């Protein structure tokens, strides 16, 4: 359990909860067809900040166990429980106004993904970076208003149908710059994922119980991220 609550753009912190729609109370989604798979349920924090992100920028998304982080407490499950290994991905959906747009029934395209690399998951990197997930918004992304959905998929129980846990939230962004590419390989949320996808229904464990996926590659679910080639 963890909540996306803050964005950085090229190392500039945009402010706690600025432009990030967040619940205060996050259970995971475990049904890939849940209506709230886009931007999560029971949003409490929703301001009218629209974050300017240059195409090409390095974007940080901050996650903490609870809203505001531990504020000095020793939380072993901050930024997220270490057991919760999995990928982190980012999608965009174009909207007319990112402050006011509803998340339902949009067309999403993938702009970044990170999975498993030499036994290290994206979630491990998140933990190493104190809750920050970094990715590069590709330089070709067309300017305009978008919701930016950051999704963490925890696979510690994913060997059982329905056992995968999806954590997500949406930031309100305006992409600026010189890009012209609006996406190619679009999905619905819900609708992107099957519960039998091999990156959703799998054992990530070797025989000793190490969550290193046993030397197997991890097939990240969803469409391919856009390429600027
Ligand atoms: Cu959890």
Domains of the chain: 3-215 (2.70.50.70)
Q: What is the resolution of this structure in A?
A: 2.3
Report the phi/psi class of residue 61: left, alpha or beta, with left for phi > 0 and alpha for psi in -120 to 50: beta
CA distance 130 to 124: 10
92: nearest Cα among 154, 171, 17, 28 = 171
Task: Indicate which technique resolved this structure.
Answer: X-ray
Query: Ligand 1 mean position to 226 CA, how many Å?
Result: 30
Inter-CA distances, 125 with 9, 80, 95, 129, 176, Å: 18, 11, 30, 6, 28
Query: Ligand 1 mean position to 84 CA, how many Å?
Result: 7
Tokens representing 141?
């992304």
Residue 193 is labelled as binding a ligand: no
Query: Ligand 1 mean position to 110 CA, how many Å?
Result: 24
43 exposure class (CB count in 10 Å sphere: 0-12, 13-18, 19+)? middle
Query: Ligand 1 mean position to 62 CA, how many Å?
Result: 16
Cis peptide before 190 (omega within 30 of 0): yes
Residue 205 is labelled as binding a ligand: no
Query: Ligand 1 mean position to 81 CA, how many Å?
Result: 6
CA distance 86 to 206: 15
Query: Ligand 1 mean position to 151 CA, how many Å?
Result: 13
Are 171 and 59 a contacting pair, CB within 8 Å? no
């Amino acid at each position: 359990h963890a909540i996306f609550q803050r964005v950085s753009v090229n190392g500039q912190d945009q402010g706690q909860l600025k432009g990030v729609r967040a619940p205060s109370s996050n259970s995971p989604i475990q049904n890939v067809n849940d209506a709230n798979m886009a931007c999560n349920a029971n949003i409490v924090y929703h301001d009218n900040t629209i974050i300017k992100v240059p195409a090409g920028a390095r974007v940080g998304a901050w996650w903490q166990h609870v809203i505001g982080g531990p504020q000095g407490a020793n939380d072993p499950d901050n930024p997220i429980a270490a057991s919760h290994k999995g990928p982190i991905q980012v999608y965009l959906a174009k909207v007319d106004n990112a402050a006011t747009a509803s998340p339902s029934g949009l067309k999403w395209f993938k702009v970044a993904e990170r999975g498993l690399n030499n036994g290290v998951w994206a979630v491990d990197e998140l933990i190493a970076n104190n809750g920050w997930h970094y990715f590069d918004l590709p330089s070709c992304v067309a300017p305009g208003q978008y919701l930016m959905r950051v999704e963490l998929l925890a696979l510690h129980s994913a060997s059982s149908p329905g056992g995968a846990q999806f954590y997500m939230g949406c930031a309100q962004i305006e992409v600026t710059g010189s890009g012209t590419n609006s996406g190619s390989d679009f999905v619905s949320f819900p609708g992107a994922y099957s519960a039998n996808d091999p990156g959703i229904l799998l054992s990530i464990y070797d025989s000793s119980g190490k969550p290193n996926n046993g030397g197997r590659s991890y097939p990240i679910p969803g469409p391919r991220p856009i390429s600027c080639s």
